[PDB]
Design an enzyme around this catalytic site. Sequence first.
Site, PDB file in Angstrom:
ATOM      1  N   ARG A   1      30.173  41.900  14.702  1.00 13.38           N
ATOM      2  CA  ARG A   1      29.352  42.014  13.513  1.00 13.38           C
ATOM      3  C   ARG A   1      29.683  41.081  12.381  1.00 13.38           C
ATOM      4  O   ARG A   1      28.972  41.069  11.389  1.00 13.38           O
ATOM      5  CB  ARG A   1      29.368  43.441  12.991  1.00 13.38           C
ATOM      6  CG  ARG A   1      28.512  44.380  13.784  1.00 13.38           C
ATOM      7  CD  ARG A   1      28.555  45.750  13.184  1.00 13.38           C
ATOM      8  NE  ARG A   1      29.705  46.520  13.632  1.00 13.38           N
ATOM      9  CZ  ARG A   1      30.094  47.652  13.061  1.00 13.38           C
ATOM     10  NH1 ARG A   1      29.431  48.132  12.020  1.00 13.38           N
ATOM     11  NH2 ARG A   1      31.130  48.314  13.539  1.00 13.38           N
TER      12      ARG A   1
ATOM     13  N   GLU B   1      34.786  41.698  28.451  1.00 10.37           N
ATOM     14  CA  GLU B   1      33.552  42.270  28.973  1.00 10.37           C
ATOM     15  C   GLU B   1      33.384  41.909  30.432  1.00 10.37           C
ATOM     16  O   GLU B   1      33.024  42.755  31.240  1.00 10.37           O
ATOM     17  CB  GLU B   1      32.330  41.752  28.218  1.00 10.37           C
ATOM     18  CG  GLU B   1      32.201  42.197  26.786  1.00 10.37           C
ATOM     19  CD  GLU B   1      30.904  41.720  26.167  1.00 10.37           C
ATOM     20  OE1 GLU B   1      29.837  42.227  26.550  1.00 10.37           O
ATOM     21  OE2 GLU B   1      30.947  40.827  25.302  1.00 10.37           O
TER      22      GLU B   1
ATOM     23  N   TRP C   1      27.046  36.238  22.115  1.00 12.21           N
ATOM     24  CA  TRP C   1      27.836  35.700  23.217  1.00 12.21           C
ATOM     25  C   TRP C   1      28.830  36.719  23.725  1.00 12.21           C
ATOM     26  O   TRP C   1      28.971  37.801  23.165  1.00 12.21           O
ATOM     27  CB  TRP C   1      28.547  34.411  22.819  1.00 12.21           C
ATOM     28  CG  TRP C   1      29.336  34.510  21.574  1.00 12.21           C
ATOM     29  CD1 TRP C   1      30.567  35.061  21.425  1.00 12.21           C
ATOM     30  CD2 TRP C   1      28.949  34.031  20.289  1.00 12.21           C
ATOM     31  NE1 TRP C   1      30.977  34.953  20.123  1.00 12.21           N
ATOM     32  CE2 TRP C   1      29.999  34.324  19.403  1.00 12.21           C
ATOM     33  CE3 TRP C   1      27.811  33.378  19.799  1.00 12.21           C
ATOM     34  CZ2 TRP C   1      29.949  33.989  18.052  1.00 12.21           C
ATOM     35  CZ3 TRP C   1      27.762  33.045  18.458  1.00 12.21           C
ATOM     36  CH2 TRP C   1      28.824  33.349  17.600  1.00 12.21           C
TER      37      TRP C   1
ATOM     38  N   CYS D   1      29.740  47.546  17.867  1.00 14.21           N
ATOM     39  CA  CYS D   1      29.780  46.086  17.961  1.00 14.21           C
ATOM     40  C   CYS D   1      30.986  45.477  17.271  1.00 14.21           C
ATOM     41  O   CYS D   1      31.245  45.739  16.099  1.00 14.21           O
ATOM     42  CB  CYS D   1      28.515  45.480  17.370  1.00 14.21           C
ATOM     43  SG  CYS D   1      28.288  43.744  17.776  1.00 14.21           S
TER      44      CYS D   1
END
Lengths: 419, 419
Positions: A121, A295, A290, A118
């Site tokens: 974070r 992505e 979000w 991630c």
Amino acid sequence: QYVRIKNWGSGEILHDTLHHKATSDFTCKSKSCLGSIMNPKSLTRGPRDKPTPLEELLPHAIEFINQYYGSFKEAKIEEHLARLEAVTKEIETTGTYQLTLDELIFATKMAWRNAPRCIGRIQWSNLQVFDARNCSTAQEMFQHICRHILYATNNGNIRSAITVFPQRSDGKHDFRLWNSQLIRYAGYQMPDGTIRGDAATLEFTQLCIDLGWKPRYGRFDVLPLVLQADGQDPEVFEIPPDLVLEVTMEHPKYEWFQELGLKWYALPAVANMLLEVGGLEFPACPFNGWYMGTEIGVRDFCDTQRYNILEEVGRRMGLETHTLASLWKDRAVTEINVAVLHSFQKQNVTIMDHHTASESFMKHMQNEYRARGGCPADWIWLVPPVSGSITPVFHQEMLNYVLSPFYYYQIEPWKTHIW
Amino acid sequence: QYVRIKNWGSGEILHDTLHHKATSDFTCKSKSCLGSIMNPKSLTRGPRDKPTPLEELLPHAIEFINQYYGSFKEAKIEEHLARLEAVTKEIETTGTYQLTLDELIFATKMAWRNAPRCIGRIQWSNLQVFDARNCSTAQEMFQHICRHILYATNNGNIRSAITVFPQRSDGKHDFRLWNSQLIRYAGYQMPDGTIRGDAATLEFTQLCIDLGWKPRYGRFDVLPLVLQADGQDPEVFEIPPDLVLEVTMEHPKYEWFQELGLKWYALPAVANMLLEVGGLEFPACPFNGWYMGTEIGVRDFCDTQRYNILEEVGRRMGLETHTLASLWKDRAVTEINVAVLHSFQKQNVTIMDHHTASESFMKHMQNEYRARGGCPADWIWLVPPVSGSITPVFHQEMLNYVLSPFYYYQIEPWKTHIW
Ligand code: HEM
Ligand code: HEM
Ligand SMILES: N=C(Nc1ccc(CCNCc2cccc(Cl)c2)cc1)c1cccs1
Ligand SMILES: N=C(Nc1ccc(CCNCc2cccc(Cl)c2)cc1)c1cccs1
Ligand SMILES: C[C@H](O)[C@H](O)[C@H]1CNc2nc(N)[nH]c(=O)c2N1
Ligand SMILES: C[C@H](O)[C@H](O)[C@H]1CNc2nc(N)[nH]c(=O)c2N1
Ligand SMILES: [Zn+2]
């Protein structure tokens, strides 16, 4: 002692000590490195069959409890020992324990904070926890999920949240969301070999249809939920179209863009992962945050295995689409990320470009080190699918270990489900 | 048995068996992954002090010999056994052995073929070997190197070659090229804190000056060689300016480009690595091949730690240089790769774009698997510093192991040198 780690762009060196607290063996062998393996067993936690041995549950339990109270600024020795005793009894007497809603909030943010793949974070402590542990039916799961999608979507101003459905027990009555993402599109495979919609969901899509769902055969048909309560078979629930927020993609310059007919939901929520805390497991606990530009623009729209629109965008840009050396793809994918980032902000949905994300992560990584001398980071996932070197993360050495709590992958329910 | 490996873009799966032949432990721990560590000890082979134990030399020797004769289509049992005996005697009698020029050519291509961080290995069998093992003086090293630079440069039509200087012995009389690249620029640090030239060579540059070299203080001053023969101190040799071929960078569209004043040598040759074959070590054996666009355009020119010209190029492109979210860097670095690729082809120097390179590697990886069920690949290095996902390599799972022969890093000679 520690493991020296350096950033080649800033020369700044760090010492990773936290890894010392890693659970089991990771994906890598003493003489071979499998760091590029996506779905390794070291990162997965599959089907359970009986309760988990008290011998191993109690040790883990004490571990967490201690960790929790340790989170506190100026501890509560009394309270700490009290709960320590209180939990042991419960385990002894009932066979498992329950987390105080507060310990669960702590568990959900730590599991996040410990997610090596991630990049957001830095936001780890801003997580909305929706306690649905008391849940008992698909109808109830469906309601909780609708509550979450509505809260999280926030009319566009995205909010991070997670819904914690019942923990696992004997493993025979597990709660599962057969989906992989609360909202996602369908992948159909037209008779003529063609694949229309989202190739990545071809298999799941099928199952849905197999479960009664009516295939509307189109590039953006939002799939229905497939909920499983108390270990029973799954039930299909259509999401209220009023709850799904979508962004229509358009280029702040190329008006020919709209014609591509591209939209994408605004809420990224993983629905198929397992939260592990204090020896407990919640096979069902969807969570969101979000999007990061890439992505959608780079992976969803360009992956050849996904929507694969990289050539079309180039042609419509009048590029030497048959001369790999011309760097037309580098040209395309970028304008595409510009459409995506601009199409979100225009409509005012929270979105985050990859250069800023990559930046906040270094800040986070800097904190995690001063904070606890370590930060499990998976370099391969943390580095963007575009701009690699152009981002600070790229020149940063990292260590990738599995701590606790943690968010594991699970095995496709339809694979390990006794109908 | 094998290790299952899959490409997510094509779904094609592979089985890696070759790893089974890996030497020692790699960079990764059973419970932690250090795959992003650049200069790990698992990839380095430092200073030796005495001869290498016959007990361990003979085993390795037989290993290679067997491997060599095994390379043959329809073997020469006679020859194979003959050399096997012939080498043992030599080791027994002399303390070490010598490779037949042919076995050395084989050794140099295999070591290349086994380089996990190389993306051009499809070319592995096209290597020009210059046997300089009989060498004995800096003056002689210098000559051999000039021969190589001239041959390799080929008036621009780059040719892959490697010069094999004397193998190591007692480790007290090692041959070393204190440089890191035959041709490279100098990094000076102007009084006013400023760094001018190539920051990456600040330290080496200093040493040179410390060895008599005259600092011409400028962004592109080609450094002198620093040769060390038979383990003696080093001697500084200026390369004949007529031998160094440089490309002046200019944009096929932005004529404001030339004004940036950017050039770059056309020959990429590593001069500080150690070749390991059959238990032997050649601490000095420079080798070259050609460039891949991104190496220059993305890393050399943009790395903040290198020439760092990414902002300047953007300003001169009139971009929102203060709005990270605008994706101006994505815009810049690309036009820069276009200048670099075009400035090479215009002047006709061999260059290779990163999309094609990334492609030939998959073809290579496909061959290596059908060939020998395995290919040591370091995903982190093999994936371009730009276009990550847009390339096929990105969606390819790999295994990273150290086989034999191999090209190891060494420790800065100036660090482990008894003057
Ligand atoms: C706040 C915004 C967030 C951003 C921008 C963000 C961004 C990312 C990105 C880009 C990925 C890549 C997924 C892929 O490429 O397939 C990811 C994965 C992940 N994130 Fe976050 N994330 C955010 C919030 C969260 C939250 C709220 C949680 C959980 C509480 C979380 C847990 C994880 C985990 C476990 C993964 C790994 C997924 C996998 O391995 O399949 N993230 N995140
Ligand atoms: C034929 C063209 C070749 C191309 C286009 C090519 C390309 C590459 C690239 C892009 C790198 C990255 C270096 C960096 O980013 O710092 C690399 C590294 C490397 N290549 Fe190749 N290469 C070629 C030929 C060769 C040859 C001829 C050899 C040796 C016989 C070789 C051995 C290696 C090794 C060992 C590395 C690792 C360097 C390190 O770890 O520092 N390559 N190559
Ligand atoms: N930014 C996000 N996007 C996102 C996160 C996770 C995933 C999951 C992708 N993983 C694919 C996969 C493949 C195989 C098995 C499993 Cl469990 C999952 C997708 C988008 C956020 C997700 C949750 C909060 S934010
Ligand atoms: N395309 C090439 N470019 C290239 C290859 C290797 C290197 C070396 C970069 N490694 C840096 C480094 C850092 C620390 C220690 C060592 Cl030994 C080396 C640079 C350019 C070719 C090199 C040799 C043939 S082709
Ligand atoms: C093979 C390799 O592990 C795989 O392609 C990874 C690379 N990095 C990634 N990074 C992110 N964020 N998401 C992904 O799906 C991947 N895929
Ligand atoms: C930390 C990380 O290992 C480091 O930045 C690596 C990443 N990938 C790379 N890839 C290539 N080809 N060359 C490099 O120098 C690097 N640097
Ligand atoms: Zn590893």
